Every structure is written in structure tokens, then in C-alpha cells.
Amino acid sequence: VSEYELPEDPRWELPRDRLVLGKPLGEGAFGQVVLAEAIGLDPNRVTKVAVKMLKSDATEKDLSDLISEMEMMKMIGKHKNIINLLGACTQDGPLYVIVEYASKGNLREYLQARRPQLSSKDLVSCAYQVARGMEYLASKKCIHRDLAARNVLVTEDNVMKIADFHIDYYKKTTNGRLPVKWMAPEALFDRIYTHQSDVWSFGVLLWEIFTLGGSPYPGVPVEELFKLLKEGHRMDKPSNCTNELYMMMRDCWHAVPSQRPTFKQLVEDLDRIVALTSN
Amino acid sequence: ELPEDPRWELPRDRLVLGKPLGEGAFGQVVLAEAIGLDKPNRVTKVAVKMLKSDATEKDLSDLISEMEMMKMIGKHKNIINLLGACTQDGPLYVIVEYASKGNLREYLQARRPPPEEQLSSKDLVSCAYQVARGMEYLASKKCIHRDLAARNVLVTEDNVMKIADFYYKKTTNGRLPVKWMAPEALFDRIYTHQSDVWSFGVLLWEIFTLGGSPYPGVPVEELFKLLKEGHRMDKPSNCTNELYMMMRDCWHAVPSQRPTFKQLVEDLDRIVALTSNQE
Ligand SMILES: Cc1cc(CNc2ncc(Br)c(Nc3cc(CCc4ccccc4)n[nH]3)n2)on1
Ligand SMILES: Cc1cc(CNc2ncc(Br)c(Nc3cc(CCc4ccccc4)n[nH]3)n2)on1
């Protein structure tokens, strides 16, 4: 257990004949993600879905991580602004974790492909949506520890969906960026992770939206980032970004976590800003 | 002994040495009172450069050459002008204009919102216009600066910008001079008016960040990388797109594509007249 078999869950189980596996989408946390077609998830209608499964070189550890991510997604519940669980194939074969398909890829890549196609209102709506998804995850006692535009997926209908539910400082991503650049000083220095440290990361994510997928602190090594933060240095105001939205970024980047806004306050402020912003 | 030049010689009794102002290129600078520089009964506050007690024969020859060069250059409102010299029977005193408000970097930092009175957007563009005018004058006298930075610009009691002094070593403020250098000056040791234009672009960024430190958190080796791959500094938080485009133009990879100081003067003159002093 679960060497020969996984326990069932009829709430989420989908017969394997109702799932037609398609093209690979890319790697994700704990395995590989493929595009698929599923027949009646929630009856005779076909839905394009994403399927996460282990890589052929996975171990028992990788399997237990994939099961725990599936179990956590069952516990989190539905929200428009998160990648939702739709089903699972757990019996008689490889584990398939079936979730929502976001056709336009990650938010970083989505914003870069739209650099001079996105109005000021579109950019604020993108921020409102991420804040809404974060507020929901926070209420479900979920701490992201990795909120960045790369961890946000965009659907065909431009809906923002968050894709996350001794740690290395020098490790780089596929686009060659350091995750420490999204971390609050207290998470970075004291390994203290809270909803307030995720608020700091949201401020970095706001900067990524307003620079249309810009790279934080470019050319700044890990050790130099530590000194800049300790010195109270903050990233510059992205070009064309309003002072109000920069003040929001700066508020998210307050040194005292209790002084940063909550996700509930960010949602209310962003809701108001979206309605006032021109398209 | 030094040869006498009656055009510039002032008797030693006509100069009353006062408080030290600070260190400068090739020696030490003190505040002084010169009796009858022009009416013979009038005193004028002047700056006096002299060698430090630990100066060498190279230091003396460098001080003489700076004095000799200043004699040739001729007068301009936007450069520190030579007023006289005590060259006979005692230490060499190079007497020049006194700029009471110190260097431009320190002048802009003391005027940041919290200390001295805030500068309007028009004041900042006027400051850039004045430095460009001084540079245009020096360029017409076939003079290449090689070290244009806000630290090398002095400010008078009347807010007149005056240019002075026309890889791991740090200044008194812990800044790397390589951060003001064009790639061709940095890599090939090629210094032209076009490499001074690059430095002017860096100086513009210092004005618009109110004495900000260029490429914060970027080490020398990483700066080399970034420049080679075409990376440039971000637009300062408080800077129009037009003024950022000017900086970027100054930072053109191909030196022949950079604006000249003549073009920068005309553009800045037009921008000053269009810029508001209301904020
Ligand atoms: C973040 C991220 C990117 C990837 C895979 N790379 C990828 N490239 C292009 C496209 Br288009 C695309 N779409 C897509 C992926 C998903 C859910 C994945 C999932 C998320 C959470 C839990 C299980 C599965 N839905 N739609 N995915 O996995 N996590
Ligand atoms: C650049 C720089 C800063 C310094 C000395 N440090 C200083 N601190 C405060 C104040 Br206020 C002040 N004023 C001032 C300095 C000068 C001419 C210097 C000079 C330049 C060239 C030749 C001779 C003399 N005039 N007025 N200077 O020297 N070069």
C-alpha cells in the first residue's frame, strides 16, 4: 500500500474508458501533464481536461506526493480562480489526476506574448482574479509558499487559475529565474511562511503583471538580494503602471507582515480599481 | 619651481584659506577668500585645490596638467571655471569657482521627500539641460570627460550645475565607476564624445532617481554580462517615457546611433519648456 493498489474514492473515480489521453502539455509538480478528452465528469458531453500522472522514472515517494496533492485538492473545494480537481483514475493502472484545462498556458508566458493586446482594465482584472483565488486558498488554510506568474494558468476565456495548493536558494527555473525573488524577508531569512508572506509574493506577482511578464531584480545574485531587502530597497514602478497600483505593491512589500494588507483587503481594493479602470 | 603665468597668478597674501570642503581629483579642496580677483578691495569666496601632504611627483604633474587644461578650455556657466593660481614660493594653489551646494548626487538625495526643499519635475529637467550644455561646451573644445557622473557635477548657491574634472575600485559612497562607462570604454578602453553620451544617460537616471545608485545589487562581472546581452536599467519610478527613451538612446550599443550633446541640449531645452513646475 500503495505498492500494488491505491484505495478507492467513488466520489472522484472515472472509468478509464471515459478518458482519451492526448498531447503532452508539459512537466508539472510531481509528474507530467497531458491534454485529454473526458466523457461526462459532472453526462454525454466531452470536456477537454488536463491529466497529471507520474513519469516512467518515478519512485514510491513521487507517487505518495501525487496522491497527497490529489487528496489536498479534494479538501480545498471549488473556486473559479484555482485549477479545480475534476476526477481521478486510481484503480487498475497508473494514477491519473484529472483537472481543469487552461489552454493559454502560464500567466508569465501569456503576458509576454501580449507585449507591444492587453488593456489597463485586463491587467487589473488579471490581478483581481489572482487575489480572489489567493483569498479562497487562504480561507482553506492553504499557504502557497510559491506565488509567481508562472504558477498561474490562463484558460481559453482568459480566467486566471492558480496552480499551487532544506529548501534551495540558488536553484533556477526553466526561464532561468530564482524563486527567492518572490519570497518575503521573514520566509527568506527565518523560514516563516504565512498568508502575509504570500501577500509579499502577490506584490511581486503584481509587478510581473504590470511589466507584462518582466523579470524581477535582473542580474541581482541571491546574496545581493538579501542586502537590498535588508536595506529596505524595493523594485521600481513599472512603466505605465498607476501610482495607486504601485502603492498596493509597496504595501504588499512592507517589512512588518502585520502592516501588509490581507488577501481580503486586496480583493476589495482590486474589485473597486477594476470598475474604475478604463479598457 | 613652476614657471610664472601673469594671466592667472594671484599674490599669496590675497588669499585667506578657510575651512576644508573635501577631497577632489589630484588633491584636497578648501574654501577661501580672495582679495581683489577682478575692485581690488572686494573679497570673493573661492575653492582652492592643493596637494595632500602625502602627494607624489605624479600627483603634482597631474594637478599642474588639470590647471593647464582649464586655462585652455575657456569660460562656460556650466563648468567649474579657473579663477587664478599661486604657483611661486610655496605650495601650488589652483583657485576656482566655489559651488556651495556640493556635488549633484548629494544635492538630489538631500531633496528627496522625507533635508532640503523638494525639486519639481521642471527643476530636474533643467538640471539635466545644464549638464548637457556644459558637456556640449566641453565637446566643442575637443574635450572628452571620461568620468561624467552626478558626483562630478557641483551645484552653486544659485542652483547652477557645474561640471568638474574634465574595475573593482569603489568611491567614498561605495559605487563602482564602471557603472557609468560605455561598453566600448569598459572593454576596449575607447573613450569618445559618444562614450560620454552613454555616461550622460546614466547621469539622467541618477537625476530621475534623485541620486539613486546605478544597477543596485549588480556585481562588476554581472554588469559585463547584462551589457553584452543588451540589458539596460529600468525606467526610474518618477520619469516620463520621453525622458526614458532619451536615456535608452544614450545607451545605444552602436556609439554612432547615440544622440550627440548638441541634440541632447535641443531636446532638453524643448522638454524643460513643456515640463510643469507644479509637481
Ligand atoms: C503550472 C503548471 C503548468 C503545467 C503543465 N504545463 C502546461 N503547459 C502548457 C499548458 Br496550455 C498547460 N495547461 C494546463 C495545465 C493544467 C493543470 C496542471 C495541474 C495543476 C495543478 C494540479 C494538477 C495539475 N491545466 N491546463 N500546462 O502544470 N502546472
Ligand atoms: C567634484 C569635487 C568635489 C570636490 C571637493 N569637495 C567639496 N565638498 C563640498 C563642497 Br560645498 C565643494 N564645493 C566646491 C568644490 C569646488 C571645486 C573643486 C575643484 C575642481 C577642479 C579643480 C579645482 C577644484 N568648488 N566648490 N567641494 O572637489 N571636486
Encode B18-75 in three state secondary structure. Answer: EEEEEEECCEEEEEEEEECCCCCCCEEEEEEEECCCCCCHHHHHHHHHHHHHHHHHCC
Query: Which residue, A101, A121, A148, sits at the end of a domain?
Result: A101
Does a structural domain hold residue B28?
yes
Does a structural domain hold residue B279?
no
CA-based max dimension of chain B? 61
* A49 and A111 belong to one structural domain: no
**Cell 550627440 sits at which residue?**
B260
Task: Indicate which of B234, B235, B242 best probes the interface with A, i.e. most A CBs within 10 Å of its own CB.
Answer: B234
Q: Closest by alpha carbon to A23, among A33, A34, A15? A: A34
**Cell 529548501 sits at which residue?**
A167
Q: Tell me the residue range of the domain where B145 lies.
A: 99-273
CA atoms within 13 A on the CB side of B97: 24
Q: Which three cell numbers stand for residue A142?
A: 492553504
* A120 and A190 belong to one structural domain: yes
Q: Closest by alpha carbon to A93, among A22, A5, A223? A: A5
Q: Closest by alpha carbon to B34, among B53, B52, B9, B51? A: B9
Q: How far apart are CA B183 and CA B224, in angstroms?
A: 8
Q: Which three cell numbers stand for residue A182?
A: 518572490
Residue B153: strand pairing partners: B163
> Residue B153: which H helix or E strand, with range?
strand B153-155
Does the beta carbon of B99 sit less than 6 angstroms from any atom of ligand 2? yes
Does a structural domain hold residue A1?
no
* Nearest residue of A to residue B225, measured between CA atoms: A219
Per residue in B37-58, is it b (16+ CB within 10 Å) or e — as a string? beeeeeebebbbbbbeeebeee
Catalytic residue among B147, B165, B249, B269: B147
* B83 and B103 belong to one structural domain: no
Which burial class, exposed, middle or buried, applies to A44 when counting CB atoms under 10 A from its CB (0-12, 13-18, 19+)? Answer: exposed
Does a structural domain hold residue A268?
yes
**Cell 476526477 sits at which residue?**
A87
Does a structural domain hold residue A191?
yes
Supply the CATH number for residue A251's domain.
Answer: 1.10.510.10
* B47 and B157 belong to one structural domain: no
> Residue B184: which H helix or E strand, with range?
helix B183-188
Integer angstrom CA distances of residue A179 from A173, A176, A229, A234, A256: 8, 10, 15, 16, 21
Task: Please give, rounded to a whole number of angstroms, the shortest distance from the CA of A220 to a CA of chain B.
Answer: 5
Of A220, A236, A237, the CB nearest to B217: A220
* A236 and A126 belong to one structural domain: yes
Query: Which residue, A83, A101, A119, sits at the end of a domain?
Result: A101
Q: Which three cell numbers stand for residue A13?
A: 473515480
Does the beta carbon of B102 sit less than 6 angstroms from any atom of ligand 2? yes
* B188 and B240 belong to one structural domain: yes
Report CA(B2)–ligand 2 centroid distance (Å). 23
Contact present, A216 and A147 (Cβ < 8 Å): no
Residue A50: strand pairing partners: A35, A99
Does a structural domain hold residue A12?
yes
Contact present, A251 and A260 (Cβ < 8 Å): yes
Residue A51: strand pairing partners: A34, A98
Does the beta carbon of B80 sit less than 6 angstroms from any atom of ligand 2? yes
* A89 and A129 belong to one structural domain: no
Q: Which three cell numbers stand for residue B203?
A: 547621469
Left (φ > 0), alpha (ψ -120 to 50) or beta: where does B261 sit?
A: alpha
Report CA(B206)–ligand 2 centroid distance (Å). 19
* B24 and B53 belong to one structural domain: yes
Whether cis (ω within 30° of 0) applies to the bond prior to B120 is no
Residues of B in contact with A217 (CB under 8 A): 217
* Nearest residue of A to residue B221, measured between CA atoms: A219
**Cell 473545494 sits at which residue?**
A77
Which burial class, exposed, middle or buried, applies to A225 when counting CB atoms under 10 A from its CB (0-12, 13-18, 19+)? Answer: buried
- DSSP secondary structure string for all residues of A45-99: -EEEEEEEE--TT--HHHHHHHHHHHHHHHHH---TTB--EEEEE-SSSS-EEEE
Q: How far apart are CA B192 and CA B184, in angstroms?
A: 9
Neighbours of B97 (CB within 10 A): 18
Q: Which of A153, A165, A173 to mutate to test the pocket of ligand 1 (most atoms within 8 A of CB)?
A: A153
> What is the DSSP secondary structure assignment for residue A159, as one 8-state letter?
-
Instruction: State whether residue A249 is helix, strand or coil.
Output: helix
Number of domains forming the structure of chain A? 2
CA atoms within 13 A on the CB side of A239: 15
Of B219, B235, B241, the CB nearest to A224: B219
Q: Does the annotation count B147 as an active-site position?
A: yes
* B83 and B175 belong to one structural domain: no
Experimental technique of record: X-ray
Contact present, A250 and A204 (Cβ < 8 Å): no
Of A218, A220, A236, the CB nearest to B237: A236
Task: Please give, rounded to a whole number of angstroms, the shortest distance from the CA of A261 to a CA of chain B.
Answer: 22
Task: Please give, rounded to a whole number of angstroms, the shortest distance from the CA of B100 to a CA of chain A.
Answer: 30
Contact present, B161 and B167 (Cβ < 8 Å): no
The residue contributing the CA closest to ligand 1 atom 27 is A25
Query: Which residue, A57, A79, A101, sits at the end of a domain?
Result: A101
Residue B49: strand pairing partners: B29, B94
Q: Which three cell numbers stand for residue A225?
A: 538580494
- Please list, in sequence order, all residues whose beta carbon lies within 8 angstroms of the beta carbon of residue A224, skipping any fewer than 6 positions away: B217, B218, B219
Supply the CATH number for residue A56's domain.
Answer: 3.30.200.20
Q: How far apart are CA B181 and CA B202, in angstroms?
A: 9
- Please list, in sequence order, all residues whose beta carbon lies within 8 angstroms of the beta carbon of residue A86, skipping any fewer than 6 positions away: A38, A41, A42, A47, A49, A98, A99, A100
Does a structural domain hold residue B172?
yes
* Cβ <8 Å between B217 and A218: no
Neighbours of B202 (CB within 10 A): 21
Left (φ > 0), alpha (ψ -120 to 50) or beta: where does A232 sit?
A: left
Breaks (C-N over 2.5 A) in chain B follow: 38, 114, 166
* A85 and A156 belong to one structural domain: no
Q: Cα B215 to chain center, whole Å? A: 20
Chain length of chain A: 279
* A251 and A174 belong to one structural domain: yes
Does a structural domain hold residue B278?
no
CA atoms within 13 A on the CB side of A138: 21
* A43 and A165 belong to one structural domain: no
Of B217, B223, B235, the CB nearest to A217: B217
- Please list, in sequence order, all residues whose beta carbon lies within 8 angstroms of the beta carbon of residue A19, skipping any fewer than 6 positions away: A36, A37, A38, A39, A49, A51, A89, A96, A98
